[PDB]
Paper text:
Active transport of proteins from the cytoplasm to the nucleus is mediated by a family of nuclear transport receptors known as importins (or karyopherins), together with a number of ancillary proteins including nucleoporins and Ran1–3. Importin α is constructed from an N-terminal importin β-binding (IBB) domain and a C-terminal NLS binding domain featuring ten armadillo (ARM)-repeat motifs. The W proteins of henipaviruses share a common N-terminal domain with P and V proteins, but have a unique NLS bearing C-terminal domain that is recognised preferentially by importins α3 and α4 (KPNA4 and KPNA3), rather than the better characterised importin α1 ([name]). In this study, we present high-resolution structures of importin α isoform adaptors bound to the NLS regions of HeV W and NiV W, providing insights into the molecular basis of importin α isoform specificity.
Crystals of the importin α1:HeV W complex had P212121 symmetry and diffracted to 2.2 Å resolution. The asymmetric unit (ASU) contained one importin α1 chain bound to a single HeV W chain, in which residues 434–441 were bound to importin α1. The interaction was mediated by 15 hydrogen bonds, one salt bridge interaction, and buried a surface area of 683.5 Å2. Notably, despite binding the same region of HeV W and NiV W, importin α3 exhibited a 2.4-fold more extensive interaction buried surface area than importin α1, with 16 additional hydrogen bonds, and six additional salt bridge interactions, consistent with its > 50-fold higher affinity. Both W proteins interacted with the major binding site of importin α1 and α3, involving residues PPTKARV of W and ARM repeats 2–4 of importin in both structures. To gain insights into the basis of isoform specificity, we superimposed the structures of importin α1:HeV W and importin α3:HeV W, and found the structures to be highly similar, with an r.m.s.d. of 1.1 Å across 411 residues, except for the positioning of ARM repeats 7 and 8. Notably, in importin α1, ARM repeats 7 and 8 are positioned closer to the inner surface of the NLS-binding interface, whereas in importin α3, these regions are positioned in a more open conformation. Because these ARM repeats provide a critical point of difference between the binding of importin α isoforms, we investigated why the W NLS region did not bind importin α1 in the extended conformation by superimposing the HeV W NLS from importin α3 onto the importin α1 structure.
Residue numbers in the entry:
A (entry chain E): 72 to 497
B (entry chain C): 434 to 441
Write the structure that this text describes.
Amino acid sequence: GTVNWSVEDIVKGINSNNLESQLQATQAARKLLSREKQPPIDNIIRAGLIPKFVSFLGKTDCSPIQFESAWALTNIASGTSEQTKAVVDGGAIPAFISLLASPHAHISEQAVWALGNIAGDGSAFRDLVIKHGAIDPLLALLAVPDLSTLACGYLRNLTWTLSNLCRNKNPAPPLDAVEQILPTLVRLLHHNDPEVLADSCWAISYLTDGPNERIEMVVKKGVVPQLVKLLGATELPIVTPALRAIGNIVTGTDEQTQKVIDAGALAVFPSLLTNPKTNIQKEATWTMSNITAGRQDQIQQVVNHGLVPFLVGVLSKADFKTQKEAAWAITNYTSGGTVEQIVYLVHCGIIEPLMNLLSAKDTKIIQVILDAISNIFQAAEKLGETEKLSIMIEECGGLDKIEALQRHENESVYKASLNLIEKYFS
Amino acid sequence: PPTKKARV
């Protein structure tokens, strides 16, 4: 009966000179700490129990107390940064790393989990886990011919802890640690479990959330095709990180973006840009905006795949954040596109929704839309068709909105609107 | 995903 002990009884048992009494008390603590209703983490810490648990981690001759203390410490470290810090300050990192080699799979699993919480606290504890040498034994746990022979929960916990070692910025993880982990991530990205795939995609998204050199580290491993494939999955927990990673990658160079395009990503965007999940729509439109910011042949790929009508649709009706991303995509398109591509954009019906968005209470989207309109007018000048465009804008109510903006708080807004009026509506 | 998770 280790259920519902008091902290005082736990302390009494752990302070006894009896390994079995200590084990029973440690299990009682584990059971307190594993209730969903307000576990008494701070009371356990204040009783001074963390150093005892950490020392129990080293009792190789009593594997059960290793396991119970590992679990208790896992749950303490799952709390606030101060509680995780309490676990770290007790010396838990090297003890858990030692436990990674345990012959008992449930114990090494618990150590993996604990290190995942510790590293998940943030950059400093992540890098400290790395400095203590966690990566080699973690990756050794996955050095088997077929991942399918590992227990599903075991593999999921390993994948999750590895993704926390890839997570956070300021600073990003050490480059050598990323290179050490990446091959195993690539292998996990081809495993058939949805949670393993989701967390692998999240790790990749972390590693691609940085400067072009980090993106290049990832892209060099050849994972973009697999990311596109996963972009097509039915499980939303997979699509979300796959799309995040793809978008991060297309914030890179035009060559990295091109690798996304070559893998066939654009063919998925008809569904992504109409996805019933608002966040998928937003992130797909953001990705598109960073593709229409590229080369004219890449804009042309967007055209060929039939995606301009979908951008018109998102501009016409979507969550406002998605509409703002769509306005960005349009401004990038018009800034980089040929005259013919901008003409095509107009023929797909961009003008009316663009104008309708000018009555929004967001200054940035107004600036973006006005820049787009200026680019389109420039193309029209190049064609000698500025009057056609003026009439089109006037017929849908855009001229009223622009003249109203002439008298707007922001400086860039009123300057750009007055310029447009004076230049094309006089 | 969650930064940390307890075992329940």
